[PDB]
Amino acid sequence: TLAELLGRSRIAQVANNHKPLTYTGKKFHPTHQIIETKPSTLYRQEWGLKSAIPSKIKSRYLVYNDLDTLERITTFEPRGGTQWNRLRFQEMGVPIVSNIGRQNPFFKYISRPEDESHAKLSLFKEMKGDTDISPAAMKKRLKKITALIRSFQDEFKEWLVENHPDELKLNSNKLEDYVVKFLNKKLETKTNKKFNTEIIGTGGLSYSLPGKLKNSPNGVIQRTVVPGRILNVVKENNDNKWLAAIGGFVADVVFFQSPPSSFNSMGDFIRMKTFLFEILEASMEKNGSVSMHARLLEPQ
Amino acid sequence: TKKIDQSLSKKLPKGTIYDPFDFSMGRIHLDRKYQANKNSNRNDIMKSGANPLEFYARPRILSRYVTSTGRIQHRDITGLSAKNQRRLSKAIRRCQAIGLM
Amino acid sequence: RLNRIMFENNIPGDKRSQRFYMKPGKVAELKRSQRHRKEFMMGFKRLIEIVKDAKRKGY
Amino acid sequence: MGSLSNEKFFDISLVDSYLNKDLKNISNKIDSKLN
Amino acid sequence: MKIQTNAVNVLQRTSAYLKSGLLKETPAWYNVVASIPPSTKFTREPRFKNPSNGHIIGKLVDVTEQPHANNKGLYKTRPNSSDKRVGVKRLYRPPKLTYVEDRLRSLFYKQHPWELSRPKILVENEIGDENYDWSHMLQIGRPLDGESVIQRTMYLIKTKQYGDMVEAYDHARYEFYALRMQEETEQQVALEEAEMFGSLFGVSAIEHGIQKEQEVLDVWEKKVVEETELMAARTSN
Amino acid sequence: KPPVYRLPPLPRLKVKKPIIRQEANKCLVLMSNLLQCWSSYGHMSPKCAGLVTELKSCTSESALGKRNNVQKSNINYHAARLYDRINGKPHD
Amino acid sequence: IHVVPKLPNSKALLQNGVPNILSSSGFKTVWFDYQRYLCDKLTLATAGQSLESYYPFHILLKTAGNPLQSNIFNLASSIHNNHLFVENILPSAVEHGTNSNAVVKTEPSRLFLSKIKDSFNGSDWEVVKEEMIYRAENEVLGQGWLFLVENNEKKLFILTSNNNGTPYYFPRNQSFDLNSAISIDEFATLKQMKELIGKSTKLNGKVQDWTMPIICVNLWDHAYLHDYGVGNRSKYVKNVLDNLNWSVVNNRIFSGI
Amino acid sequence: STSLWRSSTQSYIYGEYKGIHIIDLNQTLSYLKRAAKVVEGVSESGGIILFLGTRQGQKRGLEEAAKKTHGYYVSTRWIPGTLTNSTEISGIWEKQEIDSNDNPTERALSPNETSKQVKPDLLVVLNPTENRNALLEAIKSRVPTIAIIDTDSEPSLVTYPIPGNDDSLRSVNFLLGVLARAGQRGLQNRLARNNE
RNA sequence: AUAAUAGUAAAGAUGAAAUAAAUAAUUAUAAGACUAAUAUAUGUGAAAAUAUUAAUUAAAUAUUAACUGACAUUGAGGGAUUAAAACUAGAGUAGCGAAACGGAUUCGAUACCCGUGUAGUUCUAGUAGUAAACUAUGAAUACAAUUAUUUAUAUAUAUAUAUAUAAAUAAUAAAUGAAAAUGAAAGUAUUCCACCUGAAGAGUACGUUAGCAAUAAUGAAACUCAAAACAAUAGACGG
Ligand SMILES: [K+]
Ligand SMILES: [K+]
Ligand SMILES: [K+]
Ligand SMILES: [K+]
Ligand SMILES: [K+]
Ligand SMILES: [K+]
Ligand SMILES: [Mg+2]
Ligand SMILES: [Mg+2]
Ligand SMILES: [Mg+2]
Ligand SMILES: [Mg+2]
Ligand SMILES: [Mg+2]
Ligand SMILES: [Mg+2]
Ligand SMILES: [Mg+2]
Ligand SMILES: [Mg+2]
Ligand SMILES: [Mg+2]
Ligand SMILES: [Mg+2]
Ligand SMILES: [Mg+2]
Ligand SMILES: [Mg+2]
Ligand SMILES: [Mg+2]
Ligand SMILES: [Mg+2]
Ligand SMILES: [Mg+2]
Ligand SMILES: [Mg+2]
Ligand SMILES: [Mg+2]
Incomplete structure (x- = not known):
């Protein structure tokens, strides 16, 4: 049918997005899907959208929100520049590593309840992870849940007197433990936030596995040298490290001992010059940012 | 001169991604144009769900929605819903009558 | 700076509007x-x- | 927990089980089990 | 705008010209239009089913069909106010098409933000030629991307290999990671192998960015200097 | 949530006096600096020598220099061209 | 989707291979299997991208200057090179399937033998073939390609490539193996090439090269191992150069009529 | 966009998706086939077919469509009055006499024959929302018309509507090509019956 | 307004003027009236009206459950409420301010501007029932094509949006209309009430009823005339 075809159409494949096309806050990762048109189609203003893109657009990459609007225009920005940030990261050949030494999210590991010993930490995270929830929809998590949990009273009024009667007659320090486990055991079958929207690992920035060496005609490369730019002429206030602009990413540059004298000389125009840096490590934070650490390799 | 006004230079945060356009003057102007106090909601008690009328005895919180002379700010400036603006104004007027604001 | 306060509290405008009564x-x-x-x-x-x-987009 | 709760501020479950011979018919049941 | 009458009746108005004799010669279109009548009803048509999800439109659940108690513990014994409002408008409003895959697509790109940075071509080639066997993720003719994961997830739930959508989705995600890792290595190794055989490249991606940033930073230098001199004069006032 | 305000149908979409960025005259800023230089270091002070030399060259032929920055705004041309498309008016 | 081109007299090729060079099994590996292997990988690499609508020769030129697209370049170069090799070693380019033609006597043209003498200091074609066999054995340790190429100066010269090295674009000829040791003369050639690539003003850092292949010999294991075996690649190159289809090779030399 | 919906097109809508209305292609195909047969009939009958489209990029499709149907096209601007005021606009331009094979007879035309209105037998409009003038003139002149009718376009203004996207050059050129080939087949069948 | 304090010689007003130990400043005391921002009269109220605070009493919303079983709509007569001004008594009286008396302006100025400023404006208890008391649009019911924007209720979740159903407002299709325009009515229909029948005379005269009174309600005819009026069009003119 036509409905089946539409669901699989290339336009349906693009997930709905209404995030501001002009965002002036902090950008940590791509927010819009880049659309590309071939040179032949660009010559005919064809992008596979509803309407022809104006001929003024010469780029072959754009990002859009709405196919059509009440203003009879498409809401789009003729830019595709987050792809070059990803490809420049690939050229730096620095694998992303976990600063906490967690399991690789891209491998199906056999995990155990080592961290599940915090059942009361995360079972209540469902009601306590409400930082940005409505004052009454979050309050609907109190009566709606209470009825659901109150429907298991009979089950827990028998299991507890059949598996741990001593605690019911001595102390509730262990009873509270049996309660947290009970609900989780009766909730694992349930589906509360069964889909987790948190970023998985690198989020797709890099699929490179650590360990491989870079062979070169001049021998194996031991230190990666990448051109960059120093943004500030004074270390980040309250931090012992300056900031550099390397390959579309802002890194923290650590200097060997002293800061090169071109800093004082150039002043606030220091960004006008290119320096060579060494990328020590790259980490991924939960916000979805990349923590790139560099070192200002100076001619010596 | 080795110095530039802060208004003529953009400081790229740490951990963020950038494009060559971020070093241009257009970025400076674009950041000024689209500079709105959108982070207020998370710091705005009255945009969180509390009833502004419960703060009639807390002049410090209420003093955040009046000018230097005590004039209640128009809803266009506070950004509150009609109900919260209505309740907030009542709270301030009651606070003034009690002798606290 | 003082003049800015006067204009942001409409002090000059209010004073003028209080000179004569309006129905x-x-x-x-x-x-x-x-x-x-x-x-x-x-x-x-x-x-x-x-x-x-x-x-800007060529429309 | 309901009737078999440890909270100082309990609900009507406890008062209902008392007047319904439940908190007593379970105390004896538990004690009988201990025997 | 009013339903026009004169555009669809050209044949009948022309026929009056010919019968009276005002028009001597029959127009060339006259016979063609007579054999192929225009549609002239211009009516609004009811619809009783959403083609996307098969939801039935125009069905009222009677109280006799709700014998059991509700979530509140109360029985339904009389129609409610909503049941007593005529719903003819729903028959005529274009149905909102919805798809389960849309929910998964949003999830995938929320979990993998950088997948958005991989350019997607919306221009179709020929939808009718797609002969895909979704037992495997890779397919000849289409790229490996988020859609590969979604279609794989649907095939798993359609074949009933997995029951929960989450489990099928997770299974597809790992297949996607494996294919993404094999490609990241083929490209790295291909570059390394070429340089070892004497391949030369003019400008690298990192170099391209530096040059573009220099062009912008040069214009920015001029303006800063100019605007740091007008301020000095204007402030001197 | 930010209140959108929609205008009624209008006979025109026009800016009464379009604002334009008028770059400052280079000779006038030079004169404003030289005049200030004389106010601090004194009139004819050797510190303002360069200012005097620059001012003379700027004004040598034309007292306001080669003024070639005249500009007119195109907002009214585009506003009238696009108004019917973007006003969101209902169909006839 | 990139599909394997249909070859003339394909039924004969699938039964008796290529007489005097490859057997039926040997030709199935080099063309019917390897060409399918390459085209499928190229489709997977390029599907969903603008490169899908371009022929392999155009793809290699477009991607020659992009370091991170080398995988696509390698696949495109191999596909184009393989059909250049399979085309000049083919019994007959015309499809004599219904004409049952068994008399194809193709010999070097007068323009080809005139350019050989001019560019090789009077050496005969037979001597040049010996130089080609020698160059392949001493310059291509592993996989690669042997080409007889013509440059913008009308001079025929011999080029050897390592793995998938294009003859059209000198920065990607891959004629020097840097895994082993290189002489100062080879380093000078590489240094001079790097300077030429740096003189280009284009933002893509691309240069103009008008070299064009005339003869292509596949030096990959997919072409000779099964029929000749490890170490017998010089006997394979000798047979290929002695049984070339000169209707194709002569047509590759520009005449100007 | 659903915000720009002209509810008179309700019967052509398949549904709404991503803030736009989806046109029912099952109806588009039936309307397209009906419209195509009309073009073929007029072409096979020797009528004048004019292709009107004034959106940027449409000229190439319009010129080829006219060439393969031996028709006419206008890509720049429809002069208001071309049909109702034809003598003040089109009288000066040259006419010619042709045989059943569409070959110029070369007969010189009397000044009487060179001033008479030459009215199109069929008008095809790619963008009817911007060509109200042409549509109204066709109605006044009793000229059957074909047009692509988008969700915001009035269907009743044309004899044979084709529901479909009128904003994409691919969609327009796809529909125009089908109509142009239909005309070509009619032209070839008329030239064939003359030979035999 | 008064008193004190130091400190002075002008102050106040206006288009410009002139009439009637100060002005200004810092304190203290007294009085009456009014209610800045928020603010949109949004909302609420039958209308008139209603926006400094609190309290008491009364009334007012949506959905759900149960119940009554047409108990409804409209409404002559009737009844109640009803801005401002006005009036009858008793308080109050700062500011404002008909009138009056003065100062100016002006050819003149029974005005516009200025001064002194009485009634009135305020409160309590009443009388009276009139306004461009207007949306110049009586009330009720059924129904008809869209969009946008808020509000409310409900639903869902991969939790903050999304999906629904109503209300309000804005712009419209159709329809209607003399058109201007109306737009869920000034549309399609139904039910009930009020009212109109050329202008002027006239909402006048007379009578009657009511009121302390001013007045309010009711409400003609003769004579005369072929006029009179509305929307819109193009002009001309505009201190
Ligand atoms: K109101
Ligand atoms: K009854
Ligand atoms: K009654
Ligand atoms: K009455
Ligand atoms: K008084
Ligand atoms: K009434
Ligand atoms: Mg359209
Ligand atoms: Mg005083
Ligand atoms: Mg107020
Ligand atoms: Mg209102
Ligand atoms: Mg009544
Ligand atoms: Mg009033
Ligand atoms: Mg009195
Ligand atoms: Mg007087
Ligand atoms: Mg006088
Ligand atoms: Mg007076
Ligand atoms: Mg009364
Ligand atoms: Mg009266
Ligand atoms: Mg009245
Ligand atoms: Mg009123
Ligand atoms: Mg009522
Ligand atoms: Mg009277
Ligand atoms: Mg009038």
């Missing part, structure tokens, strides 16, 4: 018209921004 009906008419002009200007600026955005 309540006239006061209401003036308040209605002023609000309309304020709202009209906001709608005008919204349409100009769309024009500029449309021009």
Whole structure:
């Protein structure tokens, strides 16, 4: 049918997005899907959208929100520049590593309840992870849940007197433990936030596995040298490290001992010059940012 | 001169991604144009769900929605819903009558 | 800086408006018209921004 | 927990089980089990 | 705008010209239009089913069909106010098409933000030629991307290999990671192998960015200097 | 949530006096600096020598220099061209 | 989707291979299997991208200057090179399937033998073939390609490539193996090439090269191992150069009529 | 966009998706086939077919469609009055006499024959929302018309509507090509019956 | 307004003027009236009206459950409420301010501007029932094509949006209309009430009823005339 075809159409494949096309806050990762048109189609203003893109657009990459609007225009920005940030990261050949030494999210590991010993930490995270929830929809998590949990009273009024009667007659320090486990055991079958929207690992920035060496005609490369730019002429206030602009990413540059004298000389125009840096490590934070650490390799 | 006004230079945060356009003057102007106090909601008690009328005895919180002379700010400036603006104004007027604001 | 406070609290305007008495009906008419002009200007600026955005994208 | 709760501020479950011979018919049941 | 009458009746108005004799010669279109009548009803048509999800439109559940108690513990014994409002408008409003895959697509790109940075071509080639066997993720003719994961997830739930959508989705995600890792290595190794055989490249991606940033930073230098001199004069006032 | 205000149908969309960025005259800024230089270091002070030399060259032929920055705004051309498309008016 | 081109007299090729060079099994590996292997990988690499609508020769030129697209370049170069090799070693380019033609006597043309003498200091074609066999054995340790190429100066010269090295674009000829040791003369050639690539003003850092292949010999294991075996690649190159289809090779030399 | 919906097109809508209305292609195909047969009939009958489209990029499709149907096209601007005021606009331009094979007879035309209105037998409009003038003139002149009708376009203004996207050059050129080939087949069948 | 304090010689007003130990400043005391921002009269109220605070009493919303079982709509007569001004008593009286008396302006100025400023404006208890008391649009019911924007209720979740159903407002299709325009009515229909029948005379005269009174309600005819009126069009003119 036509409905089946539409669901699989290339336009349906693009997930709905209404995030501001002009965002002036902090950008940590791509927010819009880049659309590309071939040179032949660009010559005919064809992008596979509803309407022809104006001929003024010469780029072959754009990002859009709405196919059509009440203003009879498409809401789009003729830019595709987050792809070059990803490809420049690939050229730096620095694998992303976990600063906490967690399991690789891209491998199906056999995990155990080592961290599940915090059942009361995360079972209540469902009601306590409400930082940005409505004052009454979050309050609907109190009566709606209470009825659901109150429907298991009979089950827990028998299991507890059949598996741990001593605690019911001595102390509730262990009873509270049996309660947290009970609900989780009766909730694992349930589906509360069964889909987790948190970023998985690198989020797709890099699929490179650590360990491989870079062979070169001049021998194996031991230190990666990448051109960059120093943004500030004074270390980040309250931090012992300056900031550099390397390959579309802002890194923290650590200097060997002293800061090169071109800093004082150039002043606030220091960004006008290119320096060579060494990328020590790259980490991924939960916000979805990349923590790139560099070192200002100076001619010596 | 080795110095530039802060208004003529953009400081790229740490951990963020950038494009060559971020070093241009257009970025400076674009950041000024689209500079709105959108982070207020998370710091705005009255945009969180509390009833502004419960703060009639807390002049410090209420003093955040009046000018230097005590004039209640128009809803266009506070950004509150009609109900919260209505309740907030009542709270301030009651606070003034009690002798606290 | 002091002048900015006066203008942000409408001190000069209020003083002038208190020199002569205006009938309540006239006061209401003036308040209605002023609000309309304020709202009209906001709608005008919204349409100009769309024009500029449309021009930038080649429409 | 309901009737078999440890909270100082309990609910009507406890008062209902008392007047319904439940908190007593379970105390004896538990004690009988201990025997 | 009013339903026009004169555009669809050209044949009948022309026929009056010919019968009276005002028009001597029959127009060339006259016979063609007579054999192929225009559609002239221009009516609004009811619809009783959403083609996307098969939801039935125009069905009222009677109280006799709700014998059991509700979530509140109360029985339904009389129609409610909503049941007593005519719903003819729903028959004529274009149905909102919805798809389960849309929910998964949003999830995938929320979990993998950088997948958005991989350019997607919306221009179709020929939808009718797609002969895909979704037992495997890779397919000849289409790229490996988020859609590969979604279609794989649907095939798993359609074949009933997995029951929960989450489990099928997770299974597809790992297959996607494996294919993404094999490609990241083929490209790295291909570059390394070429340089070892004497391949030369003019400008690298990192170099391209530096040059573009220099062009912008040069214009920015001029303006800063100019605007740091007008301020000095204007402030001197 | 930010209140959108929609205008009624209008006979025109026009800016009464379009704002234009008028770059400052280079000779006038030079004169404003030289005049200030004389105010601090004194009139004819050797510190303002360069200012005097620059001012003379700027004004040598034309007292306001080669003014070639005249500009007119195109907002009214585009506003009238696009208004019917973007005003969101209902169909006829 | 990139599909394997249909070859003339394909039924004969699938039964008796290529007489005097490859057997039926040997030709199935080099063309019917390897060409399918390459085209499928190229489709997977390029599907969903603008490169899908371009022929392999155009793809290699477009991607020659992009370091991170080398995988696509390698696949495109191999596909184009393989059909250049399979085309000049083919019994007959015309499809004599219904004409049952068994008399194809193709010999070097007068323009080809005139350019050989001019560019090789009077050496005969037979001597040049010996130089080609020698160059392949001493310059291509592993996989690669042997080409007889013509440059913008009308001079025929011999080029050897390592793995998938294009003859059209000198920065990607891959004629020097840097895994082993290189002489100062080879380093000078590489240094001079790097300077030429740096003189280009284009933002893509691309140069103009008008070299064009005339003869292509596949030096990959997919072409000779099964029929000749490890170490017998010089006997394979000798047979290929002695049984070339000169209707194709002569047509590759520009005449100007 | 659903915000720009002209509810008179309700019967052509398949549904709404991503803030736009989806046109029912099952109806588009039936309307397209009906419209195509009309073009073929007029072409096979020797009528004048004019292709009107004034959106940027449409000229190439319009010129080829006219060439393969031996028709006419206008890509720049429809002069208001071209049909109702034809003598003041089109009288000066040259006419010619042709045989059943569409070959110029070369007969000189009397000044009487060179001033008479030459009215199109069929008008095809790619963008009817911007060509109200042409559509109204066709109605006044009793000229059957074909047009692509988008969700915001009035269907009743044309004899044979084709529901479909009128904003994409691919969609327009796809529909125009089908109509142009239909005309070509009619032209070839008329030239064939003359030979035999 | 008064008193004190130091400190002075002008102050106040206006288009410009002139009439009637100060002005200004810092304190203290007294009085009456009014209610800045918020603010949109949004909302609420039958209308008139209603925006400094609190309290008491009364009334007012949506959905759900149960119940009554047409108990409804409209409404002559009737009844109640009803801005401002006005009036009858008793308080109050700062500011404002008909009138009056003065100062100016002016050819004149029974005005516009200025001064002194009485009634009135305020409160309590009443009388009276009139306004461009207007949306110049009586009330009720059924129904008809869209968009946008808020509000409310409900639903869902991969939790903050999304999906629904109503209300309000804005712009419209159709329809209607003399058109201007109306737009869920000034549309399609139904039910009930009020009212109109050329202008002027006239909402006048007379009578009657009511009121302390001013007045309010009711409400003609003769004579005369072929006029009179509305929307819109193009002009001309505009201190
Ligand atoms: K109101
Ligand atoms: K009954
Ligand atoms: K009654
Ligand atoms: K009555
Ligand atoms: K008084
Ligand atoms: K009535
Ligand atoms: Mg359209
Ligand atoms: Mg005083
Ligand atoms: Mg107020
Ligand atoms: Mg209101
Ligand atoms: Mg009544
Ligand atoms: Mg009043
Ligand atoms: Mg009195
Ligand atoms: Mg007087
Ligand atoms: Mg006088
Ligand atoms: Mg007076
Ligand atoms: Mg009374
Ligand atoms: Mg009266
Ligand atoms: Mg009256
Ligand atoms: Mg009123
Ligand atoms: Mg009622
Ligand atoms: Mg009277
Ligand atoms: Mg009038």
